[PDB]
Write a protein that binds this ligand. Structure first.
Ligand SMILES: *[C](*)C(*)(*)(*)([C][C]([N]C(=O)[N][C]C1=[C]C([C])=C([C])[C]=[C]1)C(=O)[N][O])[C](*)*
Ligand SMILES: [Mg+2]
Ligand SMILES: [Mg+2]
Ligand SMILES: [Mg+2]
Ligand SMILES: [Zn+2]
Length: 890
């Protein structure tokens, strides 16, 4: 296959300065006329001029008004247009093409496509070449003048990037609009939308320059009532970037548009951000609570790209983490500020240590700046995004707010209106570091290893206390397992945020400090430590690593109770659970393998259970935090700690643990479920789509967590509570009633009730589908068939397909049925979906990423299905690359 290598980057021989487009939409074709004002660069060596262009039907090609002919002056193979060098001018020239495309049959949702009754584009990464010919790479920056025309009754709103400079009527019931985007950009940031869209609008005045910006949010008419929270989130996003980073919006107008059919969450096209409707639309009567946080994060994320991605863009796609890691970091700072709840940072940690750690121990393991690819689309990964964000966050930890802000401003200003690389970012941060250290010989060269080295570091600790001297030492070691990317791993620059807790009184013993580990091992010593402490390590999860605290469970309980840092408290609890999970897993596994008639299980620590009860009963402790402590670690976290995992043994392990704890705590759980009701379900703000009480939402989360535990337990008469909960006006509550009813004969009544409540809102019905799919039902395979036949049917909507199948794949007992029937079901969906949407098919491969971690019978079953998928004729390049890498063939 054609493999692109990071080291081989070279600037083009050509420059494209201006793009002038006419996009004429008709019922059964769209005609795209494009003039590129081009020139020869200083790198040119008289090569052929080669344009990307995929699936285009050529009407005409010319250079400087000279028609070019196929076979004579050019060739086209449905991927690349080659203009032979003799006909490539030697100075400024105009290249003209006209092509025909068909958005109405574009079910891949890349390029120009139809989503219900809206025409929309998605060009990142390689979609612009599906619209017209270009040198489709992000260093080819140009200014754009775009005219869209269409039938006026069908498509009354026409949008492209930038200022709308004219609107005109056209004979035969058509109309046009012309846009000028003054900001130089790569083609991946081009967008156009045409539809019968409705809007909400507001005016925002920038903080420093007092520029008036018109803000528009758009959707189809049915859902215009669901736009207000997005608009509010945009206003919050703009103010945060002003307040924290000093960054103001740079056009007179910003449009956000919701579309029903979208492969991912949203896209930062300049002035014209386009969203999956699931990440832009909500209403409190018709959305679950999680929609609100999702919309806040996604609006924020696309907005933050206006600097980190748009005004400073990528030299090449290997630099992706420079825009995505950095934007995720900006997004997370923003969400943490807006929600003011500790669960926000914890949720991010949970995501990394489950999905990203699994990826990094898989055969798909890559550094955050990859060295090669076949389809760039397969590198939009939780590694590039979420490990990238942690790498961008560690700069903040190392520098502190003031010197971080200085480095970021160095970067954003130096590279404004241009491309950048990961090195450029590291250089700007290094200038801030020298200033912070007041040492112009300090450097961050070692830091670069976070961009180039794959795998997750393991950090381990030993402690010693000298009572006579009042002197404490922390000895720290780091290790990264060799892999396919590096046979020898080097030590990283690891910042370790640390406190020391007095176990007597629970108080802080030092100013929090950040240890800078730069070697394979080091010993950090503290004087004036009056008693032997318990260390509070990696506060805030200060680096993306595996932490081996080497603490006793008694010490972990003391931190859970008394430490200040939410992450350390949560991790201490996580660690106690993991010790128990691995011990019980081993006990169950030995019993199963040895076919014992009897055996013992280690009970859950009774003092840990008491600590859980103490935290839950504390009315001043945080509800969201409580919901993390009564939940075992996610299966995808656990699996990073087990080789040859027997999924059914794990399921029995988790059931035993939950049951041990509930046998002690279920009365506490019920009491709290009832006592939290009044505040959790208070209707303050129910009619206010501009304000969300995140603390209240975390109270609902805790209630819904407790109700699941009590339902699985068959707590006496809990069905009464389930039925009452189904009458709540909050969808998070009535959909929880369906999930928790799985354990009772009432499930199919609740299935019907909630279907009727959900069926008339597209996105609520998708949340109902997820609720059914994740239900802990012994008959889940028959339920899935019922969803396919009655609700999903022949939908090509990625949100429908994802809703039906992905939750079910997390069903540890049922998906991993030792017959392989789960693996076969999902593989058939992948293959089916790959015939029209390769990106979505690759998403649906997610469950297979852990294949080589399973017991050898399940390994064999997964491998069989992966190789069957690989045999499919006309398999996409996206899917074939993914599966070849995943199965150790590429
Ligand atoms: C909404 C942001 C995340 C968003 N990216 C995203 O939703 N999915 C990843 C992705 C995958 C592929 C293949 C392509 C081609 C693009 C994106 C984002 O980064 N938005 O700016 C939270
Ligand atoms: Mg075509
Ligand atoms: Mg996010
Ligand atoms: Mg639909
Ligand atoms: Zn992004």
């Amino acid at each position: 296959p054609k493999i692109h290598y990071r080291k081989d980057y070279k600037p083009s021989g050509f420059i494209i300065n201006n793009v002038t487009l006419n996009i004429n939409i008709h019922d059964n074709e769209t005609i795209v006329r494009s003039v590129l004002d081009m020139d020869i660069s200083k790198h040119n060596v008289g090569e052929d001029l080669v344009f990307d262009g995929v699936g285009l039907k050529i009407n005409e090609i010319s250079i400087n008004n000279k028609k070019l002919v196929e076979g004579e002056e050019y060739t086209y193979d449905n991927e690349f247009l080659t203009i032979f060098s003799k006909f490539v001018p030697k100075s400024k020239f105009a290249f003209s093409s006209e092509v025909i495309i068909h958005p109405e049959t574009n079910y891949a949702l890349t390029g120009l496509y139809k989503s219900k009754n809206i025409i929309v584009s998605q060009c990142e990464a390689t979609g612009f070449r599906r619209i017209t010919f270009f040198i489709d790479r992000p260093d080819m920056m140009a200014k754009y003048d775009v005219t869209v025309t269409a039938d006026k009754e069908k498509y009354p709103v026409l949008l492209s990037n930038g200022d709308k400079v004219n609107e005109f009527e056209i004979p035969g019931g058509r109309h046009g609009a012309r846009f000028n985007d003054p900001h130089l950009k790569p083609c991946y940031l081009f967008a156009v939308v045409a539809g019968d869209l409705k809007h909400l609008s507001a005016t925002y005045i920038t903080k420093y320059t007092k520029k008036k910006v018109e803000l528009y949010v758009f959707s189809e008419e049915k859902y215009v009532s669901k736009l207000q929270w997005a608009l509010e989130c945009l206003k919050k996003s703009m103010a945060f970037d002003e307040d924290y980073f000093g960054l103001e919006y740079d056009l007179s107008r910003l449009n956000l548009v919701a579309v029903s059919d979208f492969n991912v969450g949203a896209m930062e096209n300049k002035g014209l951000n386009i969203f999956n409707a699931n990440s832009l639309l909500a209403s409190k009567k018709n959305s679950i609570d999680f929609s609100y946080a999702r919309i806040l994060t996604v609006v924020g994320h696309e907005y933050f790209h206006n600097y980190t991605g748009n005004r400073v863009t990528l030299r090449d796609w290997f630099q992706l983490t420079l825009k995505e890691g950095l934007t995720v970091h900006r997004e997370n700072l923003f969400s943490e500020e807006m929600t003011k709840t500790v669960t926000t940072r914890l949720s991010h940690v949970d995501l990394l240590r489950s999905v990203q750690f699994l990826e990094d121990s898989s055969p798909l393991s890559h550094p955050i700046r990859p060295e090669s690819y076949v389809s760039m689309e397969n590198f939009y990964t939780t590694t590039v995004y979420d490990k990238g964000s942690e790498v961008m966050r560690m700069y903040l930890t190392i520098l502190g707010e003031e010197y971080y802000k200085k480095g970021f401003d160095i970067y954003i200003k130096k590279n404004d209106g241009n491309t950048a690389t990961c090195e450029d970012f590291n250089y700007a941060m290094e200038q801030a570091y020298k200033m912070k250290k007041a040492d112009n010989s300090a450097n961050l060269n070692q830091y670069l290893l976070w961009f180039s080295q794959s795998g997750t570091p393991h950090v381990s600790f030993k402690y010693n206390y000298d009572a006579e001297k009042k002197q404490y030492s922390i000895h720290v070691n780091q290790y990264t397992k060799p892999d396919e990317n590096q046979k020898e791993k080097k030590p990283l620059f690891i910042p370790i945020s640390v406190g020391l807790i007095n176990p007597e009184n629970g108080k802080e013993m030092i100013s929090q400090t950040t240890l800078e580990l730069t070697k394979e091992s080091d010993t950090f010593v503290f004087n004036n430590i009056a008693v032997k402490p318990i260390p509070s390590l990696f506060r805030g999860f200060s680096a993306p690593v595996y932490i081996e605290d080497n603490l006793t469970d008694e010490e972990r309980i003391l931190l859970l109770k008394y430490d200040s840092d939410a992450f350390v408290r949560y991790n201490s609890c996580t660690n106690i659970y993991m010790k128990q999970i691995l011990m019980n897993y081993n006990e169950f596994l030995k019993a199963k393998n040895e076919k014992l008639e009897s055996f013992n299980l280690t009970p859950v620590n009774a003092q840990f259970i008491d600590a859980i009860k103490y935290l839950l009963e504390d009315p001043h402790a945080d509800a969201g935090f409580k919901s993390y402590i009564v939940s075992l670690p996610q299966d995808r976290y656990i699996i990073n700690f087990v080789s040859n995992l027997d999924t059914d043994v794990l399921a029995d392990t988790k059931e035993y643990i939950y049951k041990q704890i509930g046998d002690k705590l279920n009365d506490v759980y019920y009491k709290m479920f009832k006592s939290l009701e009044a505040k959790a379900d208070d209707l303050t703000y129910f009619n206010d789509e501009s304000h969300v009480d995140f603390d209240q939402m975390n109270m609902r989360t805790l209630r819904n967590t407790l109700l699941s535990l009590l339902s699985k337990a068959q707590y006496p008469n809990i069905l009464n509570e389930i039925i009452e909960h189904s009458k709540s006006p909050y969808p998070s509550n009535w959909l929880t009633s369906l999930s928790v009813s799985a354990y009772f004969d009432k499930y199919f009544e609740l299935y019907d009730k909630t279907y009727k409540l959900s069926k008339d809102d597209e996105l609520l019905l998708q949340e109902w589908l997820k609720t059914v799919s994740r239900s802990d039902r012994k008959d889940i395979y028959e339920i899935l068939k019922k969803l396919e036949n009655e609700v999903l049917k022949d939908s090509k909507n990625p949100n429908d397909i994802r809703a039906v199948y992905l939750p079910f794949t997390n069903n540890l007992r049922r998906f991993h049925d030792i017959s392989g029937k789960g693996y076969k079901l999902i593989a058939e969906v992948i293959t089916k979906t790959d015939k029209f949407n390769p990106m979505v098919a690759t998403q649906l491969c997610e469950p297979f990423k852990l294949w080589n971690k399973l017991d050898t019978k399940r390994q064999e079953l997964m491998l069989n299905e992966m190789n069957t998928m690989l045999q499919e004729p006309n398999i996409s390049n996206n899917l074939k690359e993914y599966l070849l890498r995943l199965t150790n063939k590429l």
